[PDB]
Amino acid sequence: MKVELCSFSGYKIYPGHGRRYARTDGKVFQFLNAKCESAFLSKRNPRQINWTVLYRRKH
Amino acid sequence: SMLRLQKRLASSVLRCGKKKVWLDPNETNEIANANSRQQIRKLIKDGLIIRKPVTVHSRARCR
């Protein structure tokens, strides 16, 4: 019943799941699992991954 | 019973290796009676002993 977050994949993140990333420039990201997190950490564009929400809305 | 002798003689007559000698698994008794290279020649002509073809190593991929 807390704040509902969205990932690199755009999926819904329920409380007690995933991890949160706080970069040095001051931006805060949240990930649903290590698959979505490691894709983000490898500078991979979410609009080119077929199971990502951002891809499905673009196509 | 044991065709060790006949496979060796067939290899020499056919001028191949024992890799390429095929003895008929059904006519084991017929081949077992061939204790000389002359009978081995007869079995080769009759078709009980057959020289298997060379394993294919194509160069189509290389070309």
Partner: protein, 31 residues
């Protein structure tokens, strides 16, 4: 002359292996 029954057994005695193996050419019996 080759009939259906002789052809059916011929499939057995001409295949001496699996795919890629040579077909048997003859099996002659002489004495």
């Amino acid at each position: 002359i080759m009939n259906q029954e002789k052809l059916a057994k011929l499939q057995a005695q001409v295949r001496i292996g699996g795919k890629g193996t040579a077909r048997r050419k003859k099996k002659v019996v002489h004495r």
